[PDB]
Each structure stands twice: as structure tokens, then as C-alpha cells.
Amino acid sequence: FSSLRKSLRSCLAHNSRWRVFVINPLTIENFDDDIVRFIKAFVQRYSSKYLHSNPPLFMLTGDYDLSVLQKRLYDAGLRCETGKVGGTDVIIKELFRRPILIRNPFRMEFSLRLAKRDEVIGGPQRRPDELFLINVADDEWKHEDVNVHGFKIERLSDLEYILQLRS
Amino acid sequence: FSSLRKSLRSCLAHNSRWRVFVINPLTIENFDDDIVRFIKAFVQRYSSKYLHSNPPLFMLTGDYDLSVLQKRLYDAGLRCETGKVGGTDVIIKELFRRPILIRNPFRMEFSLRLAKRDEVIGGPQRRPDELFLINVADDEWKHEDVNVHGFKIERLSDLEYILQLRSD
Amino acid sequence: FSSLRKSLRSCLAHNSRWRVFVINPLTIENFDDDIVRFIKAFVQRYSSKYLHSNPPLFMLTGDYDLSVLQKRLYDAGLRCETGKVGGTDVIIKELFRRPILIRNPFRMEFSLRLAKRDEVIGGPQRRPDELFLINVADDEWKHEDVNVHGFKIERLSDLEYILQLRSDY
Amino acid sequence: FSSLRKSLRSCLAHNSRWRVFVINPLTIENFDDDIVRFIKAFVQRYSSKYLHSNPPLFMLTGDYDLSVLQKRLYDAGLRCETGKVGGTDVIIKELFRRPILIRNPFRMEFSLRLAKRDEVIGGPQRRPDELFLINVADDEWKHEDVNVHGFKIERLSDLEYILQLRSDY
Amino acid sequence: FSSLRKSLRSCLAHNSRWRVFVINPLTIENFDDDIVRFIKAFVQRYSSKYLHSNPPLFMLTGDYDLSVLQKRLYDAGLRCETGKVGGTDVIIKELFRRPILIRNPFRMEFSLRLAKRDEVIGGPQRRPDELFLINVADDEWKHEDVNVHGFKIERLSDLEYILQLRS
Amino acid sequence: FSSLRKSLRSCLAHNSRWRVFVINPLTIENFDDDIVRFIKAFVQRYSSKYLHSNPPLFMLTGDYDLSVLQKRLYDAGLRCETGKVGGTDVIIKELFRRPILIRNPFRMEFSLRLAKRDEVIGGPQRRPDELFLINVADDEWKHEDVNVHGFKIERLSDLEYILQLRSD
């Protein structure tokens, strides 16, 4: 793990970058208790300034309930982009889009983009720079010109260390 | 205790945050003599600038006299908020309120919040970011989305090391 | 390998300099898969500012297809100078030329050069400062007054360490 | 003594604070020779700029003669406050008072305060933040909400190390 | 050699100084191949800015031919001063003169001075601050109030390390 | 030799201070050859700025000859303040006086005071801050309130190392 941690320092230095996460809930212990704090910690470090142009993408696989998490995050303070335009289906162009920004006083439209994998039918216009996989084997968005980082963990507190959120 | 000192460097980096403390004095040695100088150092470090917007909350548990400590702190040079309009009852909305700040010259309305637990019945609109429990086991404000640091100590100088007030 | 990395710290500090690379792909593992990312990282570290005034040259010996790699680089978001005007032939004066630069907002006409070695017959008027040779023994552009660094590698990732792109080995 | 040195790192970081020293000279060797240099160094390091609002106080217990020390300090180039108006008696509000200051060009009214403990009867408006005691057992100004630092030394060269005036022992 | 490197840190700290070199090529291996690069790097380090007022002097003893070296250095990009007006013999006041400088945009008249010791007759107006001798025993410019640096080398890769050109 | 170097680190930091040197050359090896270079280095480090406003004094003890060294220093590019008006006897007020200084462009009237001990009959109005003694036991300018550093050396480079002019 300490071998992996410093490998990632170059990836996470850039201010403007496109990052995807794919996660599987079942094989992580105490997931529903720590996910919210995990996201709240990532955002403040990596998505709290003007130069941080693009928010990150979180994809959860399996049969899971997004509404509850979205409400809990709204109570915590954060706003999310899901991609729906009123119905039960997801739209790619609305999911991937640029937010409004105001330099002074600082205002932001949304800080993260959330979804499920099964619903996202298709691919983006611009391939991702970094694809992170946590306990998933392979995904359709793998390519030779894209950097794939793949891990296996037993608790979420382990990943924060890798990503430099704690000591 | 050494690793925990390094464990908390990230939490105390942010300037503006809502921090809560709970203390039980019966099981701490030499409390009455050292509490004032603990509070004074914490305030002079983490709540003595303009960007430091939310003052901290100190909750004491047990049967205890706040008035004497409040007078001692006034003599030392600090001003406190207690949430009391004449009467014994504690108005919650008047204890979770923002103070007046002036950049030049620097002046503040109050520097700390002080209360008793049993007197404070209810809850806040915004949940606390960090909840420190010193010598206490359970509380009503614990939740999944709040960070909780529970400790057990025999003296205050031990806590000074953890919170970076002192070199040793 | 570790001392080689530090032997080069002084060469690569300067902002403006003329750098040439020669490569043989027949004897490298996973070349087709790692090449684009090699180029992208090098460019991002040494070709993304106003002070950086000379883009680099990459020459590939053998029988190889440049067009596909060019399309892939375009998809990745980078532009290349090849030195051709319609036809098959290559022009030295149109491959060794200065690019347009706009300071605010930053724009650059092109970020790298490309070619095949056999097609490029001739030479430049100003001789290269640094001529990296990766797995090739001898060339026609070597001289007493040019700095020459020859290496032997088995996979591309080692050069990342040698040249400070990724610290971990 | 290496243990005590870094304990005082935070206390001496601030620019504006109120410090008090109590000393006993009967049990220190070669006192009259080095007292003046001690004061001069302390003053140069902690009392020589605009942001240093409060000058420090030196109290001596015993049967000492202050006139000679005052004359020697004037020859060395320093001005002191003693807290007297013609007479023998000592006044408190003159001794604990703020001085004139001019930022540009920098000038100060007085740089230190001196006295004998017995003549000074009473207390101040504001209790002191730091009370150093050197070879002295008990004082009336000791209080729970005041920081007290008690030491035992055979020479004055050691206290300079403790207080971070000179490099090493 | 690890001893000498840091000994010279103080001499090479100042920006404006008068530095002299004396060299013997007979007992150095692979000399003609590496001289030009040595001069190039020294110049790039110590004679590229407005504060570097006085360029340095290189003297060669023996039966060497200077014309070829001057041509190679011209091709490399450096203009040299040789102290001759007409061609037969040397003139000291032309050799030891001050150049033109423009602060913005930077242009300089010449970067280095070059000569043969047998041809140079006499002494300067101001004595040298630092005199370097490489495989030479005695010289007439040795005085008590002048710093001397006598060395022995079998290659020129060593002197670069001594002078902090490479590590 | 090493810790002694660190003892003097605090003394040499101040920009403006009055400094005196007393030297005996009979017992030093290779004095004439190295004195000038010692002086030149000391001046370049400690007496070549605007804020450096109190040039140092050197006093040489014995039957030495100043004129030659003074000429050597003029050749090397430095000016000195001897203190004579008529080349017979020294005057204190003329040897202990302030120099002219122009900030832009930088120019200085003189950079050092040079003298012999026997000729300087008297004392200054302001006592020296730092008195360095090299191979002399006792002096008439020693006092309780004046710092005295006394050494014994065999070559000048040792003192150079002590005073931080050369690494080693």
C-alpha cells in the first residue's frame, strides 16, 4: 500500500483533470457508514477552488438505492448531478457538462456527479484520463491509451491513505 | 498518544469549522487549577484571527459551578457566551449565533461558548463536524456522518500534546 | 540505472533546447501500447509553456506505420508536424521551423515533430544539442561537438524513471 | 537544561507580553561582572522593535545597591524606569505604564524596569503572564492562573542557553 | 577531488570577477574532442547575464593552432576575442577591454577571451583575482596577493565535477 | 576548534557594531604573505554594504612597518584611515570618526582603520563591543562590560575557519 501511495502523486497534482471511480459495495465492510464522509473529504481537497474545473464521477454497481445517499449528502451540505430530466432514464450530455462558476464571491453549481453503471448506456465524447476500479474486474471503458488503476481493499479507510487524505 | 497527535493534523488545519467538546471533571486530577490555562491557550491558537469564524463549544457534565469559572475567565481577559436572557433557562438559538467581526482594528464580540449539558436540551440545525469526548462514553449527538474522537486521560497536560498546544 | 538518472539533471533543466530521439521498436515489449502515454507525459512536462520554444523530434527506424499513431495522438488531443505537402516526400525546411505562439490566452501551433528516418535525407543548419539513441548503435548525425547518450532497454517504462516522468521504478 | 530550553519555545514566540524576573544574587558566582551583559543581550533580542510593547521588569531581593548598576547601564547606552519621584518611596502606576514610541525614525522612551522587591508593596492592575524565579522559593504574586517558572543555577551563563541567547553551553 | 569541489564554493559565488586559466594539452587524453563542450558549459553557467561583467581568459601553451578552434566555436555560436588588429601580433589593451551590453533585449559583444602565452607579452593593469593552472608548474603572474589553484588531471571530465558543471 | 566557531555565530550577525583586533606577528607562520588576503576577505564579507556602517580596527604590536602594507592594500584596491595629519603622531578624534556614504550609486570613503598600539595613547568615548586578541595576553582596554575573545593560533587560515570566511 505504501508502495502504491507515492506512485499516485503525479496523477493527483494536476488542478484540472477528469476522474472516474467504479465501486462494488458488497465486499467492503461498514460501507453505508463511511461513504458520505469519504466523499466529503475528497471534495474539499480536490474540488474546492476556481482552478478545479471538472467535478469527479462516481459509479456504483449492484442493486442500490441512490435517493437516500443523495438526501444525506444534501443535508451534509453538498449538491450533486445525476443526469435525469424528470423521468426514469439517464442522459449522457446532461451528465457530462461544465458548471457555472463565479470567482468573487465564490459560487459553484455542483460539486460531484453520481450514478449507477447499468443505466449509463454509451460512452463519453472525451475519454477519461484516470479510471479507478475498486474490486471490479473489467469495464467497457478500458483502453490502451487510458490509465487504469485497480485495487482490492477490505475497508474504505485504507484508500484514504493511498489518496493522501490522512496520515 | 504519539500517533494520535499525528492523526489529528488534518482536522485542525481548516480555519472555519464547528467544534464541540465534552468533559467530565470528577475523574481528572488537578482540574480547577489548569482548566483556565487550557482554554486560554486553545483560544489564543485556534480562535484569535479574522478567518476563524466559528468559536468552539465547551460542555461540562456533572454538578458544577459555571459562574466562578466565568468570572475567572473575565479577569483573565476573555468573554463568553452562555445563552441566558435573565433566567435560568437556556435559549438554544441564542447560543448557536454568529458574532460581530471587524477586520481593522480587530475586535470580536465573544471568543468561546460555555454550557452545561443537562441545561442544554435539544439540538442544532447543523450537525457538528468534530465531537471530542474526554472521559465520557455515550452521548445523544453521535451520528454516522460526524467525526467522534473519544479519549481517556488522567491529566490535562496529556491533552495539550495531542492538540499541539505544547512542544512536549 | 540510478546514477544515469542523476547524470541528466543538468541537461534537462534548461527551458529552450533542441532535442532529438532515435528509437528501434522491433526489440521492445508492449511498444504499441505504451508509446502514446510516453509522448503525452514528455510533452506535458517539457512542452507546455511559453519559455519552451523548441519542440522535440522523435525518429522511428524500421518499417512502421505513422498514420495510425498520428490519428491516435489526435484523438488524445495533440498536434504533430510531419513535413509533407501532399506528396510522399519530406521537406527539412518545413519540418525544422518555428511555431506560432500566443501568450495570452496560451495557444501553440504544434507540440511535437514526427518522421521516419529513411525518408529524412539531409541535415540541419544548426546541429542538435542532445541526441538520445535508444537501442540503435550508430547514426550519421553523431559528431565531436554533440552530446550523445545511448541506452539499452527492454520496456518503455524504464525510460520514465531515467528521465524523471514517474519516480517509482 | 536541554530539557528546559525547548519548553520555553512558545512562551518567547509572542511579540507583546508581560514578563517578570525575580533574582537572588548571594548564591550566584561572578554576578556583578555579568549582570549588565545579560540585560543588554536580553534587551537587544526581545525589546528592540516597534511590536514589542511592554518592557520587562527585573526585581532583586537582598541588600543590593541599584544606583551603580543604573549608572553602568547609562554608560552602556540604556535607559531605565525606577518608579520614583524625587523621594525614596516607590510608586506603582509610574512603574507599570506604557511608553512613548515613534515608528520612523524609531525611538523609545525607556527600555527596561528595575527595582528591589521590598520597596514594592502592592499589586498590579493585570496579573503577569510569566513569572521567572531564580533561586527564589516563594513569592506573593504566585497564582493558579499565572505561569511560574522556577530554576536553580550556579552561574548566569546557563540561563542564556536556557533562554536562547547564545548557541551552545 | 571531493575535497576540492567545496573548497572553491566561495570563489565562484561572486558574479563579477577576473578569472584566468592556463592549460597544457600534451598530457591530457581526448582533448581536441572535449575542449569545445567544456568552454560551452562554463560560459552557459558563468557568462550569460547582465551582472556577469568581465568575461574569462583561456591561455594555451605549446604549439597549438587557434584558428580551427575559433571556427568551431563560431559554428557552435560563440564569438571570441583574440587581441589582434592586422594579424601578426597581440595587443594587451585590446585583449583586456570591456564589452558592450544591453539590458533589454540582452545582447553581448563577446563571451570569452583566448590566447597563446608565448605571444602574450607583458602584464595587465589590474592583477587577477583567481589564477588556475592545469598541469603547469610555474608562471610569471604568480604573486603573493593572488590566489593560485594548481591541479593535475588525466581527463577533463574531472575538472567539470570540480567546478560544479555536473554532478 | 569546531564548537569555538559556533560560539561566535551570534556575535557576527549584527550589521553595525564596533570591532577591534589586536595581533602579534612574531609567533605566526607566513604572516606577510597571507595578511592582505585575510583582510580582503573579511572586508568583502562584513564591510561592503550600506548598513555596515562601522568599519573595523586593526592594531599591530611590535616594531612593524605599516607603510608597505598600506601601499599593498592600495594596489589591491582598498583605502585605509591611519589617523595622521603630518605623519608624526596619531589623533584619536580623526581615527575614530564616521564615514561618508552614498546609497545610490554606492561609494564609501574608507573601509578599514589600521594602526600600531604604542602610538595610540588614550581611549575612546564609547567602549568597544567586541575585542579580539590573537596571541596577546593582557591589554589596557579590558573591562567587565566588554566582551573579550582571546585565541592562540599558528597560521591565519585557522582564524579564517573560526570566523567563517572559508568553509575549510
The Cα–Cα gap between E48 and D101 comes to 49
Distance from CA of A32 to the nearest CA of B (A): 9
The Cα–Cα gap between B150 and B162 comes to 12
Q: Which one of E37, E78, E157 makes the best mutation probe of the C interface by having the most chain C beta carbons within 10 Å? A: E37
The Cα–Cα gap between B146 and A160 comes to 17
Task: Tell me the sheet residues that pair with F133.
Answer: F22, F150
- The answer, for B37 touching chain D at a CB cutoff of 8 Å, is yes
The Cα–Cα gap between D141 and D121 comes to 11
State which amino acid sits at residue F78: L
Query: Considering CB atoms only, which of B33, B166, B167 is closest to D144?
Result: B33
First-to-last alpha carbon distance for chain D, in angstroms, is 9
Q: Which chains does chain A touch, 3 or more C-beta pairs < 8 A?
A: B, C
The three cell numbers of residue A34 are: 463511511
First-to-last alpha carbon distance for chain C, in angstroms, is 10
The three cell numbers of residue F46 are: 562584513
Distance from CA of E32 to the nearest CA of C (A): 9
The Cα–Cα gap between A91 and A82 comes to 9
Q: Which one of C144, C147, C148, C149 makes the best mutation probe of the E interface by having the most chain E beta carbons within 10 Å? A: C144
Per-residue b or e along E40-71, where b marks 16 or more CB atoms closer than 10 Å to that residue's CB: bebbeebbeeeebebbbbbbbbeebeeeebee
The pairing of beta strand F130-134 with beta strand F112-116:
unpaired
Per-residue b or e along E92-120, where b marks 16 or more CB atoms closer than 10 Å to that residue's CB: eeebbeeeeeeeeeeebebbbbbbbbeeb
The Cα–Cα gap between E139 and E143 comes to 10
* D144 with B75: Cβ contact below 8 A: no
- The answer, for E5 touching chain C at a CB cutoff of 8 Å, is no
Task: Tell me the sheet residues that pair with A134.
Answer: A23, A151
Task: Tell me the sheet residues that pair with B160.
Answer: none
D56 DSSP 8-state letter:
P
Query: Considering CB atoms only, which of F36, F37, F166 is closest to E10?
Result: F166
Which chain A residue's Cα is nearest to C44? A14
- The answer, for A157 touching chain B at a CB cutoff of 8 Å, is no
DSSP assignment string, C86-97: SSS---STTTS-
Residue A24 burial (CB < 10 Å; 0-12/13-18/19+)?
middle
* B168 with D9: Cβ contact below 8 A: no
Query: Considering CB atoms only, which of F33, F75, F167 is closest to E9?
Result: F167
Experimental technique: cryo-EM
State which amino acid sits at residue A146: V
Q: Which residues contact C106 (CB under 8 A, 6 or more apart)?
A: C50
Distance from CA of B56 to the nearest CA of D (A): 21
- The answer, for D10 touching chain B at a CB cutoff of 8 Å, is yes
Distance from CA of A134 to the nearest CA of B (A): 22
- The answer, for A145 touching chain C at a CB cutoff of 8 Å, is yes
Which chain D residue's Cα is nearest to F14? D44
* B36 with D145: Cβ contact below 8 A: yes
Which chain B residue's Cα is nearest to D8? B167
Cα separations (Å) of E46 from C9, E17, E40? 18, 10, 10
- The answer, for B145 touching chain A at a CB cutoff of 8 Å, is yes
H/E stretch holding F94: helix F92-95
Q: Is the distance from CB of E73 to CB of E58 less than 8 angstroms?
A: no
H/E stretch holding F102: strand F101-102
DSSP assignment string, chain E: -HHHHHHTTTTTT-SS--EEEEE--TTSSS-TTTHHHHHHHHHHHHSSSTT--SPPEEEE-SS--HHHHHHHHHHHT--EE--BSSSSSB-HHHHT----EETTTTEES-SEEEEETTT--S--SS--SEEEEES----TT--TTSEEEEE--S-SHHHHHHHTS--
Q: Is the distance from CB of D39 to CB of D1 less than 8 angstroms?
A: no
Q: Is the distance from CB of A116 to CB of A88 less than 8 angstroms?
A: no
Which chain B residue's Cα is nearest to D144? B33
* D166 with F10: Cβ contact below 8 A: yes
* Residues in E touching C147 (Cβ below 8 Å): 37
Q: Which one of A10, A17, A126, A142 makes the best mutation probe of the C interface by having the most chain C beta carbons within 10 Å? A: A10
* Residues in D touching F9 (Cβ below 8 Å): 167
Count B/D contacts: CB-CB distance under 8 Å.
17
Task: Tell me the sheet residues that pair with B133.
Answer: B22, B150
Q: Which of F142, F110, F115 is nearest to F59 (CA)?
A: F115
Helix (H, G, I), strand (E, B) or coil at C159: helix
Query: Considering CB atoms only, which of C33, C165, C167 is closest to A144?
Result: C33
Q: Which of E107, E92, E113, E108 is nearest to E18 (CA)?
A: E113
Q: Is the distance from CB of E143 to CB of E35 less than 8 angstroms?
A: no
Query: Considering CB atoms only, which of F36, F167, F168 is closest to E145?
Result: F36
3-state secondary structure chain A: CHHHHHHHCCCCCCCCCCEEEEECCCCCCCCCCCHHHHHHHHHHHHCCCCCCCCCCEEEECCCCCHHHHHHHHHHHCCCEECCCCCCCCCCHHHHCCCCCEECCCCEECCCEEEEECCCCCCCCCCCCCEEEEECCCCCCCCCCCCEEEEECCCCCHHHHHHCCCCC
The Cα–Cα gap between A143 and A156 comes to 27
Place of cell 441512490: A66
Q: Which chains does chain E touch, 3 or more C-beta pairs < 8 A?
A: C, F
Q: Answer positive or negative: Cα dihedral of B61, B67, B71, B77.
A: positive
Helix (H, G, I), strand (E, B) or coil at F148: strand
Helix (H, G, I), strand (E, B) or coil at C5: helix
Distance from CA of D12 to the nearest CA of F (A): 18
Q: Are chains E and C touching, using the cut-off of 8 Å on CB pairs and a minimum of 3 such pairs?
A: yes
- The answer, for B144 touching chain A at a CB cutoff of 8 Å, is yes
Q: How many helices and strands, by DSSP H and E, does chain D display? A: 5, 8
- The answer, for B103 touching chain A at a CB cutoff of 8 Å, is no
The Cα–Cα gap between B26 and A65 comes to 46
